[PDB]
Structures are given as structure tokens and as C-alpha cells.
Design a protein around this nucleic acid. Structure first.
Length: 674
DNA sequence: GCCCTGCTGCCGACCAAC
DNA sequence: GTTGGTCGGCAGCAGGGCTTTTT
């Protein structure tokens, strides 16, 4: 354990395993590993008898956590897996299950809004107040609402901003924020910003949770601190600065990243955070590290060119020992489809012999010409194609529907699924899920919310006093709710499938897109039971796996059944299939060898950022991060002609390219005739 | 090039009162 | 006996309508 603790750079030292001394990396390479990885972090975290209730890390989406798990189990052999790096929400929920209803009346079963719920939020904000679907863009309305939640401010301030701070922009943002805050109070819905705000509130107001979070978490893992929001920095300063004995500097420090890698400001990332870190963290030990031991000298030259080429870049110089290999080879093409053809042909000629087969080599694009091009040339090549956030996945329904039924199983507070179908002209159509959903008490003298909500043919005279619009509502979920409130999960789901006949409404009925839904709910039942292969979720994959059940608290079961988002299985060595994925799915993922089809002046410089100056700097730093997160062999290409849906747009080789020396941005070594 | 998507909508018992 | 409005579904039907990115 103590035989591999010196030799090279501090880069992966203050990233992986075992040493002392405080931490603030001014990012260099992160390449050298031999004893490097072995020599800072677990020892830093455990230096003061610091355990899981005393350790916390930062993840927005836990893909970065999974990647560091992989790195540690590979080059270290296990340490990270049992150690507490999952998310804020892990500890937040595990202690809010005990002390959540004590703050703002938000019971320990506080609900959480989601991405499809976010889209329906945009729609209902546009169509709820005196607004339209696009007058004030509800997308940016919710974005500013989240920004306000991070800043932890009431809508009243920006409402009074009329003639004080603004005239209609901030006033309207505060208006929609007030409407959504009333909705939150009526619904007890939370999100990441709401969770961190509740955590801060239960620190300040509630004593023992303060002594737990603020003082126990004197050791915290921080990676890529650039995106740390002000609420996030306030929380982390609470956990570290507000030690058990105040007046001393913040607890033992573990913060890494690169501040001028701000690429997600339009996602919500803060810009500098360095001097913001330093004054509330007097223990700030900046480590100006510039060595390198596995990345190449060509990557070094590109990094040192872009470290000063980017004006909004804290010029942290870097030096590399390894030779100048893998000049960044591009490929200029006069068509995106032809570009993808050439790139896939070269990939087939170079890799699919015995190595690099199916997963990692990917192209991140924002003009969807690469979408059709790459998949089409992969199928033409005969190799499969992988798409994670490409095309044909937004205007296609039934995924919102399946997650809607899952949420209804979790919480029957879904009414847009009922709004989808409309029962009676001007009586139970577009009104019975818009008016009475508010007041199931006095909309029309409603005695029971589901009373007149029953087909008059198959009527229930016992309860037909008054209901939604005193006519209708298509009783579809009340039977499921009363079934759920009565039986155990297995017979519940089976009864929803067959007794209520809804999965029989999917299987037997065929006129709508129903059989696909039958398959989807068969998959749902498989998920609720043991169906995954060679991998088990803790001691109980499905919610009913009582072979050795753990954590009878409903929180862990609910999260492990409700966080089914995406997956990937074919291993790293099998990277040949060009994955068609967006930058917002790979926010924390790196790949060894990549072809980038179409790096050109107008696309990777964001079309939005083509005219947006702050986002122009954001995407310049995005080019920076995409370049610097590679390891040995990163390559690009150019596609001059890009035919978008509206009108085709064209670019030459990008300004970010020519910023790097043209020899460094090659286009002739690893892109020859295939 | 579907596409949300409310409007049409047209039967089908309500429901009692006639 | 005696029946027509009005309480009730899931689906046709056109009807303008649409960046890329949309935390």
C-alpha cells in the first residue's frame, strides 16, 4: 500500500488515492498515473477518521461518478465503489427521510419533477397565466426559475424589479416564478436546486442536521469545480468551512478542475469560482501543475496553444514528456453525408479487424445532418449504429406515456395523460382536466371527484353526484389508485395489467400503437422483477426481491425503481460503432480515440453561440474541454455542406481549428483513402 | 410530414318525469 | 307503459404550424 507513493506529477495524485496536503488543482494534464493516481485522495479523505456520514462528493448526473468508479476499480482495484461518491441527493434524502417534514411542511416523501414533467411545465406555464406557448419562452422561463432557486430568492424582488430592475423581463420571470412557487407549495415538488435549498434551510434552522452536514463533511471530494453554482458553493462551504470548531479554516480540502472550462453556463455553470472559493476557503492551496506522462506532445502543443489562444482562459501552461504523436487529423468534405461515408470507411479499414467494435468512438453534433449521415453510412457498412440523443426521439410519444404510468403508480397526480383524450363536446373536452383538477371540491358542487367521471353506459349510480364539469373525465386512473391503495406491488401491477385490462388494452386492442405498449409494460414487469443479466442492483434489483431485502425505507426502493434512464453494455475495447450522441449526455465522459465529423466554423462553435457572445466564450471553452479530455489520440473532420431542416448552412474549417497550429490540426495521417 | 390538438362527434345510457 | 335531453367515451379531422440548441 505504501510502495507506490512517489515518482511523477501531482495531477492524478490529487485525483485518485493516497497522500496528504491540501488541494486546489489548476488543471494541467491529468495523465501520469503510476504512483500518481495512487498518491493523494483516499488518504486525504480518511486523514481525520472521516467516514461515509462525514464524506460527500459532487455529481449532477452520476456518469462522472461511474467513470471514477471504473478508473479506481481498474487502476486501483475497488476503493471508490464502497466509498461515498454518489450525489448530494443520496445523503440529502437519507437524512430528509427523517427531518424533511420539519421544514416547509415537505414530507419525507417529497415529490420530484422531471424532464418530461419539465416540458409539460413549460407548456402549462405558457398556457396557464396570461401567456402563450412562446411569448415568453417557457424553456428560458424555467431556466431562470432554476437560476432563482439556486440564488434562493423570492419572486417578490424581481416582481418589484418593474421600473426598479426591469420593466417586463425580470418582472415576467418573477411572475412565472411566483406561479411555479405556488404550484410547488400546492404540490411539494422539488428538484436539484430545491433539494440544495432545503438542505441549506435544514442546516440553518435545524440544529443536528447542521452539525451533521456542516461539520461531519469536513472532507469532501470536488471534481471540475468550475460548474459549481453559488448555491452549490454555499452548501460545500457549509460542509467544509463550517467545521465542528468554527474560527478555524475549512476542513481538509479536495477540490480539482479548471475554472475557465465554463461550457455549461447556458446549462447553469458558474464562470470563475476560484477567487470565490478562496475567501470562504482560506485553506485554498493552489497547485500549479504542468507535467504529463502518458498523453502525447502533440496534445501538449495543442493545449499550450489553446491555453493562451482563448482569451477567457486562465493560462495554465502544461508540459508533456511523451513524444509528439497523434496530430489531430481532420478531413475536409464537401458534404456531411460524404464526410460520414469517408469517416466510417476509414474506421472500418482501421479498426473492425480485431479491435474497437461497438461503443465508444462517437461524434457529438448539433447540426443533425451528421445524424442521418453517420447512421446511414454505418448501416451501409453493415456494422450496427448507436444513437443516444440523435434524431426522431422528441415528436415520438408513448415514452412520455410509459413514464406517466410509472409515475401514476408512484403518484396519481397526473392529469395531462387524461387531457390527451377528450370525452364530451364542450362538456368533458379540454375542460374536465383543466378546471376540476384544481377543485375536486367545488368545481360544480363535486361530491366525489370520480362520481360523474364514469361512462354513462357502464355507469356507477352509487357515485354520480357531481364530478369534472358535472359530466365526464374518462375514469381511467381512479380504479388504479384504489387498487394501489389496497394490495401489494406484485398483484397490484398484475391487476393493473389484466384485471383493469390496461395492458390488455395494449395487447388485445391493436388499432392505436398498442402492441408496442404491451411490450413496454412486459419490460416494466421484467424491471420490477429480476431481468437484468450478470448485474444485480444492491441486494434487491426489483422492488420485490425480498431474498435479502435492505433499507426498508421507501426512499431507496423508490429511487432505484424510478431512476431508469439509459444504459450501455458493449465494453470499452469495442468502440468501433460511431455513437451518435449530444454534448448534454457526455457532460462527464471521455474516450481514447475519436473521429469528429464536421468540426467547422458555425456548428461546434454553437449556432446559438454564432451570435451569442457569452455562449461564444462558453463554446470556445467547450472546444477547450473536448480537446483536453482526450488521452492519446483525438481526431476531427470537416463537412462544408450541412443541409438543416429549415435551410442549409455551410462552414469552412473552424476558427477553433486554425487557432491551433495547422500541423497540429492535421487532416492527412489517419484519414487517408480507406 | 407529420403533428399537437382542441373541435367534431355521434352514438349511448341518464333519468326522471310523463 | 313511455321517451327525449344530457350526462359520457375513445376516436376522426382539419388546420395552421416548425432551429440546431434548448439546464
Amino acid at each position: 500500500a505504501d510502495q507506490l507513493l512517489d515518482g511523477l506529477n501531482p495531477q492524478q495524485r490529487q485525483a485518485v488515492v493516497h497522500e496528504g496536503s491540501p488541494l486546489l488543482i489548476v488543471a494541467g494534464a491529468g495523465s501520469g498515473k503510476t504512483a500518481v493516481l495512487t498518491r493523494r485522495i483516499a488518504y486525504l479523505m480518511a486523514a481525520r477518521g472521516v467516514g461515509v456520514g462525514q464524506i460527500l462528493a459532487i455529481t449532477f448526473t452520476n456518469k462522472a461518478a461511474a467513470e471514477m468508479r471504473e478508473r479506481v476499480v481498474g487502476l486501483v482495484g475497488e476503493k471508490a465503489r464502497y466509498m461515498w461518491v454518489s450525489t448530494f441527493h443520496s445523503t440529502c434524502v437519507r437524512i430528509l427521510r427523517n427531518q424533511a417534514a420539519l421544514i416547509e411542511g415537505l414530507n419525507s416523501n417529497f415529490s420530484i419533477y422531471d424532464a418530461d414533467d419539465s416540458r409539460r411545465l413549460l407548456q402549462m406555464v405558457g398556457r396557464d397565466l396570461g401567456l402563450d406557448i412562446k411569448r415568453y419562452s417557457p424553456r428560458l422561463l424555467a431556466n431562470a426559475i432554476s437560476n432563482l432557486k439556486n440564488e434562493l430568492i423570492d419572486p417578490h424582488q424581481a416582481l418589484a424589479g418593474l421600473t426598479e430592475d426591469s420593466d417586463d423581463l425580470a418582472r415576467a420571470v418573477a411572475s412565472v416564478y411566483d406561479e411555479y412557487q405556488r404550484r410547488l407549495r400546492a404540490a411539494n415538488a422539488l428538484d436539484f436546486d430545491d433539494l440544495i435549498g432545503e438542505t441549506v434551510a435544514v442546516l440553518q434552522a435545524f440544529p443536528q442536521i447542521a452539525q451533521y452536514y456542516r461539520r461531519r463533511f469536513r472532507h469532501v471530494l470536488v471534481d471540475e469545480y468550475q460548474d459549481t453554482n453559488h448555491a452549490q458553493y454555499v452548501l460545500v462551504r457549509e460542509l467544509v468551512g463550517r467545521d465542528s470548531n468554527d474560527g478555524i479554516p475549512p476542513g481538509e480540502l479536495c477540490v480539482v478542475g479548471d475554472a475557465d472550462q465554463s461550457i455549461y453556463a447556458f446549462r447553469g455553470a458558474t464562470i470563475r469560482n476560484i477567487e470565490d472559493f478562496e475567501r470562504d476557503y482560506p485553506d485554498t492551496r493552489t497547485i500549479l501543475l504542468e507535467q504529463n506522462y502518458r498523453s502525447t506532445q502533440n496534445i501538449l502543443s495543442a493545449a499550450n496553444s489553446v491555453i493562451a489562444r482563448n482569451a477567457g482562459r486562465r493560462e495554465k501552461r502544461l508540459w508533456t514528456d511523451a513524444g509528439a504523436g497523434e496530430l489531430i487529423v481532420g478531413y475536409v468534405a464537401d458534404n456531411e453525408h460524404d464526410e460520414a461515408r469517408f469517416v466510417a470507411e476509414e474506421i472500418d479499414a482501421l479498426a473492425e479487424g480485431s479491435e474497437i467494435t461497438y461503443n465508444d468512438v462517437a461524434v457529438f453534433y448539433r447540426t443533425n445532418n451528421s445524424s442521418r449521415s453517420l447512421e446511414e453510412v454505418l448501416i451501409r457498412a453493415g456494422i450496427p449504429y448507436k444513437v443516444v440523443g440523435g434524431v426522431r426521439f422528441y415528436e415520438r410519444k408513448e415514452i412520455r406515456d410509459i413514464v406517466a404510468y410509472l409515475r401514476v403508480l408512484d403518484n396519481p397526480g397526473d392529469a395531462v395523460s387524461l387531457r390527451r383524450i377528450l370525452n364530451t363536446p364542450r362538456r368533458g373536452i379540454g375542460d374536465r382536466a383543466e378546471a376540476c383538477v384544481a377543485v375536486y371540491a367545488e368545481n360544480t358542487g363535486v361530491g366525489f371527484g370520480d362520481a360523474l367521471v364514469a361512462a354513462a353506459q357502464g355507469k356507477v349510480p352509487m357515485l354520480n353526484t357531481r364530478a369534472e364539469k358535472a359530466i365526464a373525465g374518462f375514469v381511467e386512473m381512479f380504479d388504479e389508485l384504489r387498487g394501489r391503495l389496497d394490495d401489494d406491488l406484485g398483484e397490484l401491477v398484475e391487476a393493473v395489467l389484466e384485471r383493469t385490462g390496461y395492458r390488455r388494452e395494449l395487447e388485445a386492442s391493436t388499432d392505436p400503437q398498442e402492441l408496442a405498449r404491451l411490450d413496454n409494460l412486459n419490460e416494466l414487469v421484467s424491471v420490477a422483477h429480476e431481468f437484468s443479466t450478470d448485474r444485480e442492483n444492491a441486494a434487491a434489483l426489483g422492488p420485490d426481491d425480498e431474498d435479502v431485502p435492505d433499507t426498508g425505507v421507501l426512499a431507496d426502493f423508490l429511487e432505484r425503481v424510478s431512476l431508469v434512464a439509459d444504459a450501455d453494455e458493449i465494453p470499452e475495447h469495442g468502440a468501433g460503432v460511431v455513437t451518435l450522441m449530444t454534448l448534454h449526455t457526455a457532460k462527464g465522459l471521455e474516450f481514447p480515440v475519436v473521429f469528429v465529423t464536421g468540426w467547422e466554423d458555425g456548428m461546434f462553435p454553437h449556432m446559438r453561440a454564432l451570435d451569442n457572445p457569452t455562449e461564444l466564450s462558453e463554446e470556445r471553452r467547450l472546444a477547450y474541454v473536448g480537446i483536453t479530455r482526450a488521452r492519446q489520440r483525438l481526431y476531427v473532420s470537416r463537412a462544408i455542406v450541412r443541409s438543416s431542416w429549415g435551410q442549409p448552412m455551410l462552414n469552412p474549417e473552424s476558427r477553433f481549428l486554425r487557432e491551433i497550429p495547422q500541423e497540429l490540426i492535421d487532416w492527412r495521417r489517419t484519414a487517408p483513402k480507406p
